[PDB]
Enzyme design. Structure first.
Site, PDB file in Angstrom:
ATOM      1  N   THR A  10       7.384  62.266  19.483  1.00  0.00           N
ATOM      2  CA  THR A  10       7.186  61.622  18.179  1.00  0.00           C
ATOM      3  C   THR A  10       5.764  61.115  18.098  1.00  0.00           C
ATOM      4  O   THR A  10       5.264  60.525  19.049  1.00  0.00           O
ATOM      5  CB  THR A  10       8.158  60.456  17.973  1.00  0.00           C
ATOM      6  OG1 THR A  10       9.497  60.957  18.033  1.00  0.00           O
ATOM      7  CG2 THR A  10       7.946  59.772  16.618  1.00  0.00           C
ATOM      8  N   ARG A  69      20.988  66.543  13.224  1.00  0.00           N
ATOM      9  CA  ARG A  69      20.774  65.126  13.522  1.00  0.00           C
ATOM     10  C   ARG A  69      19.461  64.693  12.861  1.00  0.00           C
ATOM     11  O   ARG A  69      18.444  65.396  12.949  1.00  0.00           O
ATOM     12  CB  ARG A  69      20.755  64.908  15.050  1.00  0.00           C
ATOM     13  CG  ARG A  69      20.473  63.494  15.550  1.00  0.00           C
ATOM     14  CD  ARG A  69      18.966  63.150  15.572  1.00  0.00           C
ATOM     15  NE  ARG A  69      18.711  61.858  16.206  1.00  0.00           N
ATOM     16  CZ  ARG A  69      17.503  61.321  16.403  1.00  0.00           C
ATOM     17  NH1 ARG A  69      16.410  61.943  16.009  1.00  0.00           N
ATOM     18  NH2 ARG A  69      17.389  60.145  16.996  1.00  0.00           N
ATOM     19  N   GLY A  78      17.071  61.226  12.699  1.00  0.00           N
ATOM     20  CA  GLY A  78      16.785  59.884  13.185  1.00  0.00           C
ATOM     21  C   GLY A  78      16.057  59.007  12.173  1.00  0.00           C
ATOM     22  O   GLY A  78      16.197  59.186  10.966  1.00  0.00           O
ATOM     23  N   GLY A  86      10.722  55.364  19.454  1.00  0.00           N
ATOM     24  CA  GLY A  86      11.765  54.799  20.291  1.00  0.00           C
ATOM     25  C   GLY A  86      13.114  55.370  19.928  1.00  0.00           C
ATOM     26  O   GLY A  86      13.211  56.448  19.309  1.00  0.00           O
ATOM     27  N   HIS A  87      14.170  54.654  20.313  1.00  0.00           N
ATOM     28  CA  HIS A  87      15.526  55.153  20.125  1.00  0.00           C
ATOM     29  C   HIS A  87      15.855  55.193  18.636  1.00  0.00           C
ATOM     30  O   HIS A  87      16.086  54.156  18.015  1.00  0.00           O
ATOM     31  CB  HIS A  87      16.533  54.306  20.908  1.00  0.00           C
ATOM     32  CG  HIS A  87      17.933  54.829  20.848  1.00  0.00           C
ATOM     33  ND1 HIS A  87      19.023  54.014  20.623  1.00  0.00           N
ATOM     34  CD2 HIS A  87      18.425  56.084  20.969  1.00  0.00           C
ATOM     35  CE1 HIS A  87      20.124  54.743  20.617  1.00  0.00           C
ATOM     36  NE2 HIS A  87      19.790  56.004  20.827  1.00  0.00           N
TER      37      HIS A  87
HETATM   38  N1  LIG Z   1      12.198  57.955  17.125  1.00  0.00           N
HETATM   39  C1  LIG Z   1      12.385  59.354  17.607  1.00  0.00           C
HETATM   40  C2  LIG Z   1      12.211  59.471  19.128  1.00  0.00           C
HETATM   41  C3  LIG Z   1      10.788  59.168  19.588  1.00  0.00           C
HETATM   42  O1  LIG Z   1      10.151  58.263  19.015  1.00  0.00           O
HETATM   43  O2  LIG Z   1      10.312  59.840  20.533  1.00  0.00           O
HETATM   44  C4  LIG Z   1      13.763  59.860  17.222  1.00  0.00           C
HETATM   45  O3  LIG Z   1      14.777  59.279  17.620  1.00  0.00           O
HETATM   46  O4  LIG Z   1      13.877  60.853  16.509  1.00  0.00           O
END
Ligand SMILES: N[C@@H](CC(=O)O)C(=O)O
Ligand SMILES: N[C@@H](CC(=O)O)C(=O)O
Ligand code: NA
Ligand code: NA
EC number: 3.4.19.5
Lengths: 295, 295
Positions: free
Chosen positions: A155, A183, A185, A207-208
Site C-alpha cells: 500500500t 475484498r 479494504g 495497516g490492517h
Molecule cells: N490498508 C491495506 C494494507 C496495507 O496498508 O498494506 C489494506 O488492508 O488493503
C-alpha cells in the site's frame, strides 16, 4: 502563500530486508521528489499526490500497481482513492484489474463522472471508455509476491499542501496477501484510507484494512486535529484507539492546513519520505530519520 | 437493562404522492414490527436491524432488494452494510446482483469471513459459497422501476439498541436511478451509510450518496453526540454541514447509547418509523407523526 509540502508512504509492515530497504528507500525518495517537483512549478495538491502515487504504483517494491500483493487466486485486484480538500471532491476505485495506475482512474472518476466510487466490472468498463490501456495480468505480478502467497497458502500513499493552501491525499494498494476475491479494504474508502479537508488537514492510511475501516482512521485523526491536538498527538490518539478498540495496527501520514506534518505508526515499520523547504526527509523505523538537501 | 428500541427509515425522497404515501406506511410498520418483535424476544440489535431491512428489501415499494432502482443498463446493482456497536464488527457488499437480500449477504461478510467489505464478482462467489439463492435479475426489477429509468435518461435503513445495550445499524439500497455501471454509493461504506458504536450510538443515513461519502455523514453525527449535542442537535448540524459544504441533501436515523432517538432530514420527505415503550412513532413529512399503541 503557503510553504508547500508533500508526505509519502509505502506501507506499514513488519521487519524489512536490509538489502530491500535500499530499493524501498530509493522508492520513497523518488516518489517524494516527483511530488515536490510537481509542487515546485506551483502545482496543485491533487496533482502532487496523484503524481507521487503513480510513481509508487510503477515501483515493484511496493504493494500498489506493479508489485501489488496477490489475492487467494494468485491474482491482482487493486484499490485507490483521491480527495480534493477544497470542495471535498473525491474519486475511488475498488477491485480493479490489469491496469497500470489505479489512482489515475480514481482521479478519472472524480473528474469525469458525477460519482465518486466505481467498482470491479464497471470500473473496468469506465477505464476502457477513458482510454486506459489494459496491461497483461502477469506484468503486475512479481515473483516475490508469488512466494509471499505460497507461504500463506500452506500500500502506498501521499498527502500534500499546495502554494494556495489546499490539501489532498492519495492512497493506492493491491490489498492484503491471500485476501478473498472482491475484498475491499480501507484504501479506496473516504474517511478510512484517507481524508482531506482544507479546514483541517489531509491524511493517507495504511495497516490492517478492516480495522482502518472499523475506526474510520483518516477522519478520526482529523477529528482530533480539529479538537486542537498537534498532528503527532492526534496520530497517536487515532492509531492508539485502533490498537486499543479493535486491536489493529497501522500507520499514517498527515499534513495540517498550517503545514505541520508527521509520519507515525504502530506496525513495526513504515517507509516514509517528506519534502518541504528544499530538504528531503526519510524514515522506516521509529526515531530513525535522515534529512538531505533536495535540488 | 435498557428498553429496546428500533428506528427504521424508507429513504430520503422528493415529494410523495397520495397512493404511495399510505403504501409506504404499511411497509414501514411491518419492518419496525419485525425489528421490535426481535427486540422484545431477547434478540440482538444486529438481528433486529437485519430483520427490519430484509422486510424493506423484500417489499417492492422500497429502493432495496426487490424494487431497487436500475443502473444505466437496466440492471439491479445493490449495496448494503451492517455494523455491531460492541466491537465494531461489520460487514458490507457493493454492486451485488441476482439476490433478494443484500443485507443478509452483508451479515455473512461480518460473521463468516475475516473481511468487512466485498464487491461484485467476489461478493457473488461468497454468496454461492454461503448457499445464498441465485435468482434471475429480472425478478428484482419491478414495472415502476422500468418506467423511471426510461424517464431519467430523457434507500432503507434500521438502527436498534437492545436490552443488553448493544447498538447496530443496517443500510441497503438499489443506489440511484441510471447510475453508471458499478457505481457505489454511501450505503455499504462504514461511517457513510451508517456507523454503530456501543459507546456512542448508531446512525443510518440516506440521500445523495456522493455527498454522504464526502462528509462521512453517519460518523459525523456520532461526533456531535460525543461533544454533548443531543441526538436531534447532532443530526441537525451534520445534515447542516452536508448542505453548506457539498450541496447535499438526505436524512438519517440516530439512536444514542442511552435510548434517545430521532429521524431528521433536509430532503423533502423521509418515510420513517420507531418503536419503543410499546408505542409506534411514524411519519413521512416534517412533523406529521402518528404515535400509536403497539399491542
Ligand atoms: N490498508 C491495506 C494494507 C496495507 O496498508 O498494506 C489494506 O488492508 O488493503
Ligand atoms: N444513498 C443512496 C441513495 C439514497 O439513499 O437516496 C446511494 O447513493 O446509493
Ligand atoms: Na508498485
Ligand atoms: Na425492496
Amino acid at each position: 502563500h503557503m510553504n508547500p509540502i508533500v508526505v509519502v508512504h509505502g506501507g506499514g509492515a513488519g521487519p524489512i530486508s536490509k538489502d530491500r530497504k535500499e530499493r524501498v528507500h530509493q522508492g520513497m525518495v523518488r516518489a517524494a521528489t516527483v511530488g515536490y517537483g510537481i509542487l515546485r512549478e506551483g502545482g496543485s495538491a491533487v496533482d502532487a499526490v496523484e503524481g507521487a502515487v503513480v510513481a509508487l504504483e510503477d515501483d515493484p517494491e511496493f504493494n500498489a500497481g506493479c508489485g501489488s500483493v496477490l489475492n487467494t487466486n494468485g491474482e491482482v485486484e487493486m484499490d485507490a482513492s483521491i480527495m480534493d480538500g477544497k470542495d471535498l471532491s473525491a474519486g475511488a476505485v475498488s477491485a480493479v484489474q490489469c491496469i497500470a495506475n489505479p489512482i489515475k482512474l480514481a482521479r478519472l472518476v472524480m473528474e469525469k463522472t458525477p460519482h465518486c466510487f466505481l467498482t470491479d466490472q464497471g470500473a473496468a468498463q469506465f477505464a476502457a471508455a477513458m482510454g486506459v490501456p489494459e496491461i497483461p495480468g502477469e506484468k503486475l505480478v512479481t515473483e516475490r509476491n508469488k512466494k509471499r502467497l505460497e507461504k500463506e497458502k500452506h500500500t502506498v500513499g501521499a498527502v500534500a499542501l499546495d502554494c494556495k493552501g489546499n490539501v489532498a491525499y492519495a492512497t493506492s494498494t493491491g490489498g492484503i496477501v491471500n485476501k478473498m476475491v472482491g475484498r475491499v479494504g480501507d484504501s479506496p474508502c473516504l474517511g478510512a484510507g484517507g481524508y482531506a479537508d482544507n479546514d483541517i488537514g489531509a491524511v493517507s492510511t495504511t495497516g490492517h484494512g478492516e480495522s482502518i475501516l472499523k475506526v474510520n482512521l483518516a477522519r478520526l485523526t482529523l477529528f482530533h486535529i480539529e479538537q486542537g491536538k498537534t498532528v503527532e498527538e492526534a496520530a497517536d490518539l487515532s492509531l492508539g484507539y485502533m490498537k486499543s478498540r479493535v486491536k489493529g495496527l497501522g500507520g499514517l501520514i498527515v499534513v495540517s492546513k498550517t503545514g505541520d506534518w508527521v509520519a507515525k505508526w504502530t506496525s513495526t515499520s513504515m517507509p516514509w519520505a517528506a519534502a518541504k523547504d528544499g530538504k528531503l526527509h526519510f524514515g522506516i523505523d521509529p526515531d530513525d530519520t535522515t534529512i538531505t538537501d533536495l535540488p
